[PDB]
């Protein structure tokens, strides 16, 4: 094959890999293309391997604490170090999983960060819209403990 | 009590609400009264939040809230929610809206960043001979014979 054609198919292989990888994580039809089948075959083949490395990567990746603004530099360093001592099909799959896990940890950092934005939405709205005074006049938040 | 004290406790009531609701969504004792309130409100209406799950998930996907328009939409919806009355149920509804809104905002973020990571993988495999390595071995489809 051509080295250009492989790169174009990789986008389709990685999307399917992230899909079927996520689907077998959630739960734990046939793809409409060959690259979609490849990404699916690679996700299911090593399901048992990715789980034994699950606790390790979940802890180490939360140590790295990757964000949207530093995700590229960490991907370049880690990917480079991954293939420095050789390239085999297993390390290619590992590159796919790293992109999968990296995207997960980036937007767990984002949601937790945005959940603080929404928290300020609620606090300020209840303050400036008498919702807090409504609850204050009825005995504070603790009053809701008698519901149910 | 004063509405100032209520606003300060709301941040802790909402954080606990998002916590214990999520825990029951996927799947001790709080260390304070406000943490218990957010927990009491989350478990009391689990079956109600479940019957409204498909409707709010579809409607919020229609809204397509982002981090840059989440405040405009939160202020309009909260105002319209309390325009025709304030009761304890509508207060709980405001908490759930903040919970779902933060989720749908970063469903948009994950899919958006999954395209950033995709460009990471494609470009790295291109500029680091990984694509040529697989191309010289028969393209992505060759990986379909792994696993037999």
């Amino acid at each position: 094959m051509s080295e250009e054609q492989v790169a174009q198919d990789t986008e389709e292989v990685f999307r399917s890999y992230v899909f079927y990888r996520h689907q077998q994580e959630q739960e734990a039809l046939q793809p409409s293309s060959t690259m979609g089948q490849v990404g699916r075959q690679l996700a299911i083949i090593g399901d048992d391997i990715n789980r034994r490395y699950d606790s390790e990567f979940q802890t180490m990746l939360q140590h790295l604490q990757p964000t949207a603004e530093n995700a590229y530099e960490y991907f370049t360093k880690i990917a480079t170090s991954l293939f420095e001592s050789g390239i085999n099909w297993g390390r290619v799959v590992a590159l796919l999983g790293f992109g999968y896990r990296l995207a997960l940890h980036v937007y767990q950092h984002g949601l937790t960060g945005f959940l603080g934005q929404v928290t300020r939405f609620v606090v300020d709205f209840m303050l400036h819209h008498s919702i807090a005074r409504w609850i204050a006049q009825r005995g504070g938040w603790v009053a809701a403990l008698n519901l149910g | 009590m004063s509405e100032e004290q209520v606003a300060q406790d709301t941040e802790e009531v909402f954080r606990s609400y998002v916590f214990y609701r999520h825990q029951q969504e996927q799947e001790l004792q709080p260390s304070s009264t406000m943490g218990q309130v957010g927990r009491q409100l989350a478990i009391i209406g689990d079956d109600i939040n479940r019957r409204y799950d498909s409707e709010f998930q579809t409607m919020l996907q229609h809204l397509q809230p982002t981090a840059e328009n989440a405040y405009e939409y939160f202020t309009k919806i909260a105002t319209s929610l309390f325009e025709s009355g304030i009761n304890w149920g509508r207060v709980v509804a405001l908490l759930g809206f903040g919970y779902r809104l933060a989720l749908h905002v970063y469903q948009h973020g994950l899919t958006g960043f999954l395209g950033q990571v995709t460009r990471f993988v494609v470009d790295f495999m291109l500029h680091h001979s990984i694509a040529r390595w697989i191309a010289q071995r028969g393209g992505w489809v060759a990986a379909l014979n792994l696993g037999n």
Partner: peptide, 23 residues
């Protein structure tokens, strides 16, 4: 030691084990 170096390492045995049981 370094976190970046440790993650790249665990990706290697990652793939090498995968490559050993499927390639």
């Amino acid at each position: 030691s370094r976190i970046i170096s440790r993650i790249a390492q665990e990706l290697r045995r990652x793939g090498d084990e995968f490559n050993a049981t499927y390639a």
